[PDB]
Amino acid sequence: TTYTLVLLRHGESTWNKENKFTGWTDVPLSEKGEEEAIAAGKYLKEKNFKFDVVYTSVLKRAICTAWNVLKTADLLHVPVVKTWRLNERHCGSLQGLNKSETAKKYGEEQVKIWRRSYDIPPPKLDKEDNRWPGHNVVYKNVPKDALPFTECLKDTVERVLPFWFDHIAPDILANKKVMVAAHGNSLRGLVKHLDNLSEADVLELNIPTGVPLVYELDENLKPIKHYYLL
Amino acid sequence: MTTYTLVLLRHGESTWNKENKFTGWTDVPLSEKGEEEAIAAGKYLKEKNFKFDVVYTSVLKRAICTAWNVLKTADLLHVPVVKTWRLNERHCGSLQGLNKSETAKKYGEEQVKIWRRSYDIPPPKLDKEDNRWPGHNVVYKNVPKDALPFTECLKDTVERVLPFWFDHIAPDILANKKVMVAAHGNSLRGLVKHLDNLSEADVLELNIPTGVPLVYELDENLKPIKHYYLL
Amino acid sequence: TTYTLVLLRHGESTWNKENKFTGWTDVPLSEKGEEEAIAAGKYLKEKNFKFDVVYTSVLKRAICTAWNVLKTADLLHVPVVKTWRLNERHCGSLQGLNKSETAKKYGEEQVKIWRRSYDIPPPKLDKEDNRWPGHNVVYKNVPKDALPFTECLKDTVERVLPFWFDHIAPDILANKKVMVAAHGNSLRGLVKHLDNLSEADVLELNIPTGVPLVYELDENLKPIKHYYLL
Amino acid sequence: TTYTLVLLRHGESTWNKENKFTGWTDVPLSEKGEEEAIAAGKYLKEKNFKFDVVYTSVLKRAICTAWNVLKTADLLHVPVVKTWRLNERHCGSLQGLNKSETAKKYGEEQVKIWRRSYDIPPPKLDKEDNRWPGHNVVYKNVPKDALPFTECLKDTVERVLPFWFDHIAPDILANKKVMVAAHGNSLRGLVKHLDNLSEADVLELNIPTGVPLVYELDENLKPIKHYYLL
């Protein structure tokens, strides 16, 4: 028995261009970022990949990538399920700030720790901060104390896992063809469990943008292999 | 006084509307004009400050792409979209794919007129060997084959829509969710027939414009208080 | 590719003994009625029938039948989905009345028509009547205009079939082993569709109490055969 | 705004009479444990407690509690949602062994540590052991990695919290009346989060069997107060 799982990281956003920390900030794809999702959709169509369900975040840049893939591949009827659990890693009080001004405010050494470490997060938001996800209507049905004030990669890995165990994985076991269209850090959390990686290994893992990552899994969901369609 | 707001929206022009070809369940895309109409609907809904908790649509791309363009322009991409065959356009049977001169040649122009304007007289049936039968399309692989039409009249479309109203749309409205239904002329006519308790005569005369939001204000029992177009 | 579907009719209610028209009246199984479901479970256990989902009505005489089956087969973990659409045919203003009282106030032959006919329903309740389902909190999430003042067998067939098409049949097509536990007329509606019966045929059909009705279906859900486990 | 949540721990299982470690072993309620469930049902009905949903585990001692309550309260129409996440704390290789026997092998103080600590689990099951939930068809839809070889209370707490955030809390915020009918340790997991308890507080917390525990919560689901119905 072989199941097939496809992971896809969204392309460039407008804030990647302006050199700002994004996190849960809901910024759009750039034109190039849209172009990547379309190209990803071609490669999947060219290899005749089909899907019974698409999982993505509640952030437009991921959602739009999912949409462009399904449109390009002629699979618009496929249900799309959107969850905050697949959101990008939250960047705390860094969200919105220029990456350079931060590197001269806190120093480049401290800023590097917050980006590259596994378990040391950036400084928290207060709940009175306008960037606190609890103020955003997008999250009105979610209990507000489930929402982060800040995240390290470990936090992201821990919030993605219940969604893997409760929705994605059961669908795979039911013989559904799943695509996960999400963000680097949330996808790294999925990959960490899939291949049972150490902290060192997940930190060295870089998932390229707009390139479908295909996992073949056995009856127990142990990876038989993985590869990129490029 | 408890009031609820429901928004209905018919998709814009498809590629086959130009060619004057009967579409039905054929999954033809919106033309560029159909794209822009969905955007314009979205722009206007954003301007009048409309918000949605759920969008219901068909499994046909011209309707789905309309929902998408509205959510995107209105900055509501996080909103769930639920897609169902029960909101599909009326099935046109053996007319699907053919233009008016082809159908006149096969059936005579007078038979075709009856099928266009009737309530309960459907056009000729497809059978299981015809490649246009929804049963051969993998889009419907999880739908029981005998739920899928070989042909439909408006009465059929009306009857298959009603269950989805009672099971999914109406309960959402009663839970104070702000619903948009983005669909097709005939499936929307099926919802309106029930809402306003229209006779067969009145539903036949009803002509819902394309790409114009149709707003229904409903009371606590979902009886309409009023309806109007945003245009 | 063959699928297996089980149908089961609940045992004797307390009102069957009293000889009153039941309908949607939510009367319990008699003790005998509980024994019938327990025996039904034993039969299914003996032939090692497993279930992934049980569908039933929102009426206790059917819910409790399902419970007793799952309990006897040691399958309590299996999800039970309850719906108004699988309810018994509504008996209108006859609900709660004696079968002799109805003969008196309506005539004996008029009553037989209401029971045996396909499309002639008994007299309507009005909105002011206490027995109208709209006053019952059980149906508080159901829009009130979807609920009947009375029903003929045609009505029952037409409310059951959307639930067959939307929920039961798609489960079967997902290779889930389904049991439907319900009522005479709601089951007769399902059978009518399964076997594409005429009106005359469905009116002659007599589904016995507490005996599992097994359908073998092909890949398109067309019945290959059916039989009773006894 | 405020909300009302009801918790209930199941009564005595047959293995409690034998002083045996149960964990995920799916043993039935004792007759006393059935009566407790029925008595709980009478109390709730008397005080006019209604429910829109009942959450329970996939273990029959909890499921049968939920059923006996609904039956006595005359609320059989209410959906029951069963989840492994609400299962009892897993007892590793101790499952099936009696408490006197276990003292001789490991020593009584070491057994106390496994019974009473927060973060030290009993000896873990082998993957090849018959008792590993991964061999149980009840969990065929759950990825094997989610299935424990052993648990400390900390593990149980961490597996219950996602179900709180994903299912229970959104229902409460959607104005649904929820009952959770489960196990001592899984309920302690919920209470730990609800009352923001320290590790020390939750270890001393002792929830009696078969007594409904009512929580009153504010608009952000923070408890205003809680009490037992006795």
Tab-separated table of N, CA and C in Angstrom, chain B residues 50-185:
chain	number	residue	atom	x	y	z
B	50	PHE	N	-20.616	44.782	3.634
B	50	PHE	CA	-21.116	43.411	3.833
B	50	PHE	C	-19.986	42.458	4.230
B	51	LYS	N	-20.285	41.552	5.162
B	51	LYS	CA	-19.344	40.525	5.608
B	51	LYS	C	-20.032	39.161	5.559
B	52	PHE	N	-19.242	38.098	5.408
B	52	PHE	CA	-19.780	36.735	5.364
B	52	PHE	C	-19.022	35.783	6.278
B	53	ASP	N	-19.757	34.849	6.880
B	53	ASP	CA	-19.184	33.784	7.695
B	53	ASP	C	-19.025	32.494	6.885
B	54	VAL	N	-19.844	32.325	5.847
B	54	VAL	CA	-19.761	31.156	4.980
B	54	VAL	C	-20.252	31.500	3.579
B	55	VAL	N	-19.614	30.899	2.574
B	55	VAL	CA	-20.069	30.985	1.194
B	55	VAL	C	-20.425	29.599	0.680
B	56	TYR	N	-21.633	29.471	0.136
B	56	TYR	CA	-22.072	28.239	-0.513
B	56	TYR	C	-22.071	28.443	-2.015
B	57	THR	N	-21.615	27.430	-2.742
B	57	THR	CA	-21.571	27.516	-4.190
B	57	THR	C	-21.745	26.136	-4.820
B	58	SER	N	-21.707	26.075	-6.147
B	58	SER	CA	-21.859	24.793	-6.848
B	58	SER	C	-20.489	24.111	-6.978
B	59	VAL	N	-20.392	23.049	-7.777
B	59	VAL	CA	-19.090	22.449	-8.064
B	59	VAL	C	-18.604	22.819	-9.467
B	60	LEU	N	-19.251	23.814	-10.083
B	60	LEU	CA	-18.896	24.296	-11.412
B	60	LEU	C	-18.018	25.538	-11.308
B	61	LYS	N	-16.941	25.579	-12.086
B	61	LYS	CA	-15.904	26.581	-11.893
B	61	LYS	C	-16.421	28.012	-12.049
B	62	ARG	N	-17.343	28.236	-12.986
B	62	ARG	CA	-17.863	29.589	-13.229
B	62	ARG	C	-18.541	30.201	-12.001
B	63	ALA	N	-19.168	29.351	-11.186
B	63	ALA	CA	-19.740	29.767	-9.906
B	63	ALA	C	-18.641	29.890	-8.834
B	64	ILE	N	-17.788	28.865	-8.723
B	64	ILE	CA	-16.695	28.854	-7.737
B	64	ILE	C	-15.759	30.058	-7.928
B	65	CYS	N	-15.388	30.321	-9.178
B	65	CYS	CA	-14.491	31.437	-9.517
B	65	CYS	C	-15.134	32.794	-9.197
B	66	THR	N	-16.464	32.833	-9.222
B	66	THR	CA	-17.233	34.018	-8.858
B	66	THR	C	-17.151	34.249	-7.354
B	67	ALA	N	-17.410	33.201	-6.571
B	67	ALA	CA	-17.197	33.241	-5.123
B	67	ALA	C	-15.782	33.714	-4.784
B	68	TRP	N	-14.783	33.118	-5.433
B	68	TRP	CA	-13.380	33.462	-5.181
B	68	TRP	C	-13.120	34.949	-5.394
B	69	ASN	N	-13.468	35.452	-6.578
B	69	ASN	CA	-13.245	36.860	-6.926
B	69	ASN	C	-13.949	37.831	-5.973
B	70	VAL	N	-15.106	37.433	-5.449
B	70	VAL	CA	-15.816	38.254	-4.475
B	70	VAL	C	-15.082	38.267	-3.135
B	71	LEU	N	-14.769	37.085	-2.608
B	71	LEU	CA	-14.025	36.994	-1.352
B	71	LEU	C	-12.693	37.743	-1.431
B	72	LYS	N	-11.986	37.600	-2.548
B	72	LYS	CA	-10.679	38.238	-2.709
B	72	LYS	C	-10.776	39.762	-2.725
B	73	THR	N	-11.703	40.294	-3.518
B	73	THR	CA	-11.866	41.748	-3.657
B	73	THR	C	-12.393	42.344	-2.355
B	74	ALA	N	-13.215	41.575	-1.648
B	74	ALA	CA	-13.764	42.002	-0.366
B	74	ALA	C	-12.799	41.758	0.810
B	75	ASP	N	-11.627	41.183	0.535
B	75	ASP	CA	-10.627	40.872	1.568
B	75	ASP	C	-11.158	39.873	2.614
B	76	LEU	N	-11.829	38.827	2.140
B	76	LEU	CA	-12.431	37.808	3.011
B	76	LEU	C	-11.979	36.383	2.643
B	77	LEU	N	-10.716	36.235	2.255
B	77	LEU	CA	-10.202	34.941	1.770
B	77	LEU	C	-10.249	33.804	2.803
B	78	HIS	N	-10.242	34.150	4.087
B	78	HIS	CA	-10.316	33.154	5.164
B	78	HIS	C	-11.680	32.460	5.276
B	79	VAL	N	-12.718	33.041	4.676
B	79	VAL	CA	-14.081	32.526	4.814
B	79	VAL	C	-14.235	31.172	4.113
B	80	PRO	N	-14.818	30.183	4.808
B	80	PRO	CA	-14.977	28.879	4.190
B	80	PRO	C	-15.926	28.897	2.995
B	81	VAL	N	-15.560	28.130	1.973
B	81	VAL	CA	-16.369	27.953	0.786
B	81	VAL	C	-16.818	26.494	0.755
B	82	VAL	N	-18.132	26.259	0.782
B	82	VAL	CA	-18.687	24.907	0.681
B	82	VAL	C	-19.309	24.698	-0.703
B	83	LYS	N	-18.827	23.665	-1.397
B	83	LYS	CA	-19.157	23.405	-2.798
B	83	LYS	C	-20.066	22.191	-2.907
B	84	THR	N	-21.201	22.334	-3.592
B	84	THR	CA	-22.177	21.247	-3.698
B	84	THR	C	-22.837	21.140	-5.076
B	85	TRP	N	-22.989	19.902	-5.560
B	85	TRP	CA	-23.708	19.633	-6.807
B	85	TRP	C	-25.158	20.114	-6.759
B	86	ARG	N	-25.734	20.185	-5.555
B	86	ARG	CA	-27.113	20.635	-5.370
B	86	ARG	C	-27.383	22.088	-5.759
B	87	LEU	N	-26.325	22.880	-5.915
B	87	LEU	CA	-26.455	24.250	-6.417
B	87	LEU	C	-26.048	24.386	-7.888
B	88	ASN	N	-25.760	23.264	-8.554
B	88	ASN	CA	-25.445	23.292	-9.995
B	88	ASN	C	-26.575	23.910	-10.823
B	89	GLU	N	-26.198	24.479	-11.965
B	89	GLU	CA	-27.136	24.904	-12.995
B	89	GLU	C	-28.096	23.774	-13.368
B	90	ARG	N	-29.256	24.142	-13.905
B	90	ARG	CA	-30.193	23.154	-14.437
B	90	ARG	C	-29.507	22.371	-15.553
B	91	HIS	N	-29.576	21.047	-15.481
B	91	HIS	CA	-29.040	20.178	-16.539
B	91	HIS	C	-29.863	20.303	-17.831
B	92	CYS	N	-29.190	20.509	-18.970
B	92	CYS	CA	-29.853	20.708	-20.279
B	92	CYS	C	-29.921	19.439	-21.154
B	93	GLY	N	-29.566	18.293	-20.590
B	93	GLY	CA	-29.663	17.010	-21.292
B	93	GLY	C	-28.859	16.923	-22.577
B	94	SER	N	-29.489	16.420	-23.633
B	94	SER	CA	-28.822	16.273	-24.932
B	94	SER	C	-28.593	17.610	-25.650
B	95	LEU	N	-29.150	18.699	-25.118
B	95	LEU	CA	-28.879	20.026	-25.667
B	95	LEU	C	-27.475	20.513	-25.321
B	96	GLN	N	-26.875	19.978	-24.252
B	96	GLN	CA	-25.558	20.452	-23.785
B	96	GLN	C	-24.489	20.333	-24.867
B	97	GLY	N	-23.812	21.444	-25.147
B	97	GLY	CA	-22.756	21.482	-26.152
B	97	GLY	C	-23.202	22.014	-27.499
B	98	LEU	N	-24.504	21.966	-27.766
B	98	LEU	CA	-25.026	22.364	-29.064
B	98	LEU	C	-25.463	23.826	-29.063
B	99	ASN	N	-25.355	24.474	-30.222
B	99	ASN	CA	-25.911	25.816	-30.416
B	99	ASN	C	-27.354	25.740	-30.917
B	100	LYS	N	-28.020	26.894	-30.977
B	100	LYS	CA	-29.443	26.967	-31.343
B	100	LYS	C	-29.777	26.446	-32.746
B	101	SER	N	-28.852	26.582	-33.690
B	101	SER	CA	-29.094	26.100	-35.052
B	101	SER	C	-28.949	24.576	-35.142
B	102	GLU	N	-28.070	24.009	-34.320
B	102	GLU	CA	-27.916	22.555	-34.234
B	102	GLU	C	-29.139	21.907	-33.579
B	103	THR	N	-29.655	22.526	-32.519
B	103	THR	CA	-30.813	21.989	-31.799
B	103	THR	C	-32.097	22.139	-32.616
B	104	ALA	N	-32.216	23.244	-33.346
B	104	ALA	CA	-33.337	23.453	-34.261
B	104	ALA	C	-33.349	22.407	-35.378
B	105	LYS	N	-32.161	22.037	-35.853
B	105	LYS	CA	-32.007	21.038	-36.915
B	105	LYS	C	-32.393	19.622	-36.450
B	106	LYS	N	-32.035	19.276	-35.215
B	106	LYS	CA	-32.382	17.973	-34.637
B	106	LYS	C	-33.839	17.895	-34.208
B	107	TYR	N	-34.316	18.940	-33.537
B	107	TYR	CA	-35.591	18.871	-32.830
B	107	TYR	C	-36.695	19.799	-33.339
B	108	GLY	N	-36.361	20.737	-34.222
B	108	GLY	CA	-37.304	21.781	-34.603
B	108	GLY	C	-37.300	22.874	-33.550
B	109	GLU	N	-37.422	24.119	-33.999
B	109	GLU	CA	-37.295	25.277	-33.115
B	109	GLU	C	-38.418	25.352	-32.076
B	110	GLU	N	-39.579	24.789	-32.403
B	110	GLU	CA	-40.730	24.823	-31.494
B	110	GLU	C	-40.598	23.897	-30.286
B	111	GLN	N	-40.052	22.695	-30.475
B	111	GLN	CA	-39.744	21.816	-29.334
B	111	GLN	C	-38.721	22.475	-28.411
B	112	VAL	N	-37.713	23.128	-28.990
B	112	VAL	CA	-36.650	23.748	-28.199
B	112	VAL	C	-37.191	24.913	-27.364
B	113	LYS	N	-38.095	25.700	-27.944
B	113	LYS	CA	-38.767	26.781	-27.217
B	113	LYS	C	-39.477	26.254	-25.973
B	114	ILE	N	-40.261	25.191	-26.143
B	114	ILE	CA	-40.980	24.573	-25.023
B	114	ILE	C	-40.017	24.208	-23.901
B	115	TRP	N	-38.907	23.560	-24.251
B	115	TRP	CA	-37.932	23.118	-23.251
B	115	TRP	C	-37.224	24.275	-22.541
B	116	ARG	N	-37.040	25.395	-23.236
B	116	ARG	CA	-36.410	26.578	-22.638
B	116	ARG	C	-37.321	27.252	-21.609
B	117	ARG	N	-38.610	27.350	-21.929
B	117	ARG	CA	-39.545	28.168	-21.152
B	117	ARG	C	-40.484	27.370	-20.243
B	118	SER	N	-40.424	26.043	-20.307
B	118	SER	CA	-41.288	25.200	-19.479
B	118	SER	C	-40.823	25.153	-18.019
B	119	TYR	N	-41.731	24.735	-17.143
B	119	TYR	CA	-41.402	24.490	-15.753
B	119	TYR	C	-41.116	23.010	-15.520
B	120	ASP	N	-41.930	22.138	-16.110
B	120	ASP	CA	-41.856	20.713	-15.799
B	120	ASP	C	-41.679	19.788	-17.011
B	121	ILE	N	-41.323	20.351	-18.167
B	121	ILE	CA	-41.029	19.554	-19.359
B	121	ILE	C	-39.543	19.678	-19.707
B	122	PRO	N	-38.760	18.625	-19.413
B	122	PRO	CA	-37.322	18.681	-19.630
B	122	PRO	C	-36.933	18.361	-21.070
B	123	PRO	N	-35.745	18.812	-21.503
B	123	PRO	CA	-35.224	18.419	-22.808
B	123	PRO	C	-34.866	16.920	-22.840
B	124	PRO	N	-34.501	16.381	-24.018
B	124	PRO	CA	-34.237	14.937	-24.135
B	124	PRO	C	-33.138	14.400	-23.210
B	125	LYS	N	-33.277	13.138	-22.809
B	125	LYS	CA	-32.352	12.489	-21.874
B	125	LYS	C	-31.015	12.115	-22.503
B	126	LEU	N	-29.938	12.286	-21.740
B	126	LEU	CA	-28.695	11.567	-22.004
B	126	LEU	C	-28.915	10.124	-21.531
B	127	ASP	N	-28.103	9.187	-22.004
B	127	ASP	CA	-28.060	7.867	-21.369
B	127	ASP	C	-26.647	7.557	-20.903
B	128	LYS	N	-26.496	6.444	-20.191
B	128	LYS	CA	-25.228	6.086	-19.547
B	128	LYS	C	-24.043	5.939	-20.508
B	129	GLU	N	-24.313	5.761	-21.800
B	129	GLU	CA	-23.254	5.598	-22.797
B	129	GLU	C	-22.751	6.931	-23.345
B	130	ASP	N	-23.489	8.003	-23.083
B	130	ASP	CA	-23.119	9.333	-23.555
B	130	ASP	C	-22.020	9.907	-22.662
B	131	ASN	N	-20.957	10.429	-23.275
B	131	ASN	CA	-19.833	10.997	-22.514
B	131	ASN	C	-20.178	12.237	-21.669
B	132	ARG	N	-21.321	12.875	-21.935
B	132	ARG	CA	-21.753	14.040	-21.160
B	132	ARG	C	-22.487	13.668	-19.856
B	133	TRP	N	-22.779	12.386	-19.640
B	133	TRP	CA	-23.453	11.967	-18.404
B	133	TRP	C	-22.559	12.237	-17.187
B	134	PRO	N	-23.052	13.030	-16.214
B	134	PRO	CA	-22.270	13.331	-15.000
B	134	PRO	C	-21.656	12.107	-14.311
B	135	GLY	N	-22.280	10.941	-14.463
B	135	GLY	CA	-21.729	9.691	-13.955
B	135	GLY	C	-20.346	9.294	-14.461
B	136	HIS	N	-19.931	9.815	-15.617
B	136	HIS	CA	-18.581	9.553	-16.157
B	136	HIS	C	-17.543	10.556	-15.672
B	137	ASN	N	-18.004	11.631	-15.039
B	137	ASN	CA	-17.126	12.686	-14.546
B	137	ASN	C	-16.695	12.375	-13.106
B	138	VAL	N	-15.384	12.370	-12.868
B	138	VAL	CA	-14.834	12.030	-11.552
B	138	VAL	C	-15.108	13.102	-10.491
B	139	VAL	N	-15.496	14.301	-10.919
B	139	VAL	CA	-15.995	15.333	-9.998
B	139	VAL	C	-17.108	14.795	-9.089
B	140	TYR	N	-17.887	13.840	-9.601
B	140	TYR	CA	-19.041	13.280	-8.892
B	140	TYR	C	-18.832	11.841	-8.402
B	141	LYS	N	-17.578	11.409	-8.277
B	141	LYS	CA	-17.267	10.030	-7.870
B	141	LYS	C	-17.784	9.641	-6.475
B	142	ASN	N	-17.947	10.616	-5.586
B	142	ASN	CA	-18.509	10.350	-4.258
B	142	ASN	C	-20.025	10.588	-4.183
B	143	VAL	N	-20.635	10.929	-5.317
B	143	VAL	CA	-22.075	11.080	-5.390
B	143	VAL	C	-22.655	9.804	-6.001
B	144	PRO	N	-23.726	9.253	-5.399
B	144	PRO	CA	-24.405	8.102	-6.003
B	144	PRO	C	-24.893	8.437	-7.407
B	145	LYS	N	-24.616	7.551	-8.359
B	145	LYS	CA	-24.847	7.820	-9.780
B	145	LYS	C	-26.294	8.141	-10.129
B	146	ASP	N	-27.241	7.517	-9.438
B	146	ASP	CA	-28.661	7.774	-9.702
B	146	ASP	C	-29.190	9.047	-9.016
B	147	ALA	N	-28.306	9.791	-8.349
B	147	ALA	CA	-28.617	11.154	-7.930
B	147	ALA	C	-28.284	12.138	-9.048
B	148	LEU	N	-27.536	11.685	-10.055
B	148	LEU	CA	-27.069	12.571	-11.112
B	148	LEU	C	-28.038	12.531	-12.292
B	149	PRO	N	-28.405	13.705	-12.822
B	149	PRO	CA	-29.439	13.770	-13.853
B	149	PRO	C	-28.962	13.372	-15.251
B	150	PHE	N	-29.861	12.773	-16.027
B	150	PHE	CA	-29.684	12.648	-17.475
B	150	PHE	C	-30.247	13.889	-18.182
B	151	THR	N	-31.165	14.576	-17.506
B	151	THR	CA	-31.748	15.822	-17.979
B	151	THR	C	-32.456	16.448	-16.789
B	152	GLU	N	-32.805	17.729	-16.901
B	152	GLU	CA	-33.583	18.415	-15.869
B	152	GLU	C	-34.510	19.479	-16.454
B	153	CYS	N	-35.692	19.601	-15.853
B	153	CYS	CA	-36.524	20.781	-16.009
B	153	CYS	C	-36.340	21.625	-14.752
B	154	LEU	N	-36.950	22.804	-14.715
B	154	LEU	CA	-36.786	23.697	-13.570
B	154	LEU	C	-37.348	23.075	-12.297
B	155	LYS	N	-38.438	22.325	-12.430
B	155	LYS	CA	-39.021	21.625	-11.288
B	155	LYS	C	-37.984	20.722	-10.615
B	156	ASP	N	-37.228	19.968	-11.415
B	156	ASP	CA	-36.154	19.113	-10.887
B	156	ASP	C	-35.127	19.918	-10.101
B	157	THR	N	-34.658	21.009	-10.702
B	157	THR	CA	-33.627	21.848	-10.108
B	157	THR	C	-34.110	22.402	-8.773
B	158	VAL	N	-35.358	22.871	-8.772
B	158	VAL	CA	-36.032	23.364	-7.571
B	158	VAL	C	-36.090	22.308	-6.463
B	159	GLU	N	-36.383	21.068	-6.841
B	159	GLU	CA	-36.532	19.999	-5.865
B	159	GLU	C	-35.198	19.535	-5.270
B	160	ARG	N	-34.130	19.538	-6.063
B	160	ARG	CA	-32.821	19.120	-5.558
B	160	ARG	C	-32.118	20.199	-4.731
B	161	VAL	N	-32.495	21.455	-4.940
B	161	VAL	CA	-31.949	22.567	-4.166
B	161	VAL	C	-32.561	22.622	-2.756
B	162	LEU	N	-33.852	22.331	-2.646
B	162	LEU	CA	-34.570	22.508	-1.379
B	162	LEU	C	-33.935	21.764	-0.190
B	163	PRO	N	-33.495	20.506	-0.387
B	163	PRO	CA	-32.840	19.794	0.713
B	163	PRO	C	-31.609	20.509	1.255
B	164	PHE	N	-30.819	21.090	0.359
B	164	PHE	CA	-29.611	21.791	0.753
B	164	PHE	C	-29.926	23.078	1.515
B	165	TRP	N	-31.040	23.722	1.167
B	165	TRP	CA	-31.547	24.861	1.925
B	165	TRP	C	-31.884	24.432	3.348
B	166	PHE	N	-32.701	23.398	3.491
B	166	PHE	CA	-33.142	22.964	4.821
B	166	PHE	C	-32.016	22.366	5.693
B	167	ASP	N	-31.092	21.636	5.077
B	167	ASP	CA	-30.035	20.930	5.809
B	167	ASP	C	-28.817	21.796	6.135
B	168	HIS	N	-28.471	22.747	5.270
B	168	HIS	CA	-27.219	23.487	5.438
B	168	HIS	C	-27.350	25.007	5.466
B	169	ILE	N	-28.041	25.602	4.492
B	169	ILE	CA	-28.096	27.068	4.407
B	169	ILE	C	-28.971	27.658	5.518
B	170	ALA	N	-30.203	27.180	5.634
B	170	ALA	CA	-31.148	27.728	6.616
B	170	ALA	C	-30.675	27.610	8.079
B	171	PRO	N	-30.131	26.446	8.478
B	171	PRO	CA	-29.537	26.348	9.821
B	171	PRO	C	-28.394	27.348	10.096
B	172	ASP	N	-27.538	27.598	9.104
B	172	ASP	CA	-26.497	28.627	9.230
B	172	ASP	C	-27.105	30.014	9.467
B	173	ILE	N	-28.174	30.331	8.741
B	173	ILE	CA	-28.837	31.621	8.896
B	173	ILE	C	-29.404	31.733	10.314
B	174	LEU	N	-30.022	30.650	10.787
B	174	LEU	CA	-30.614	30.599	12.126
B	174	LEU	C	-29.573	30.585	13.251
B	175	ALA	N	-28.318	30.267	12.926
B	175	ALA	CA	-27.214	30.382	13.888
B	175	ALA	C	-26.514	31.750	13.789
B	176	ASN	N	-27.168	32.707	13.134
B	176	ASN	CA	-26.646	34.061	12.968
B	176	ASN	C	-25.345	34.122	12.149
B	177	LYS	N	-25.163	33.177	11.230
B	177	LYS	CA	-24.070	33.262	10.264
B	177	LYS	C	-24.514	34.103	9.076
B	178	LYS	N	-23.603	34.919	8.557
B	178	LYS	CA	-23.882	35.743	7.389
B	178	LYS	C	-23.500	34.966	6.132
B	179	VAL	N	-24.513	34.536	5.384
B	179	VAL	CA	-24.322	33.622	4.271
B	179	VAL	C	-24.369	34.338	2.927
B	180	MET	N	-23.478	33.930	2.027
B	180	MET	CA	-23.619	34.223	0.609
B	180	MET	C	-23.771	32.914	-0.146
B	181	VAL	N	-24.763	32.856	-1.028
B	181	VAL	CA	-24.888	31.751	-1.970
B	181	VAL	C	-24.477	32.273	-3.347
B	182	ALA	N	-23.382	31.740	-3.888
B	182	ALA	CA	-22.912	32.115	-5.230
B	182	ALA	C	-23.181	30.960	-6.188
B	183	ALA	N	-24.143	31.136	-7.089
B	183	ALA	CA	-24.612	30.010	-7.898
B	183	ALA	C	-25.065	30.417	-9.292
B	184	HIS	N	-26.124	29.763	-9.767
B	184	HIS	CA	-26.584	29.868	-11.141
B	184	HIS	C	-28.026	30.365	-11.162
B	185	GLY	N	-28.433	30.951	-12.283
B	185	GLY	CA	-29.786	31.487	-12.419
B	185	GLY	C	-30.863	30.542	-11.913
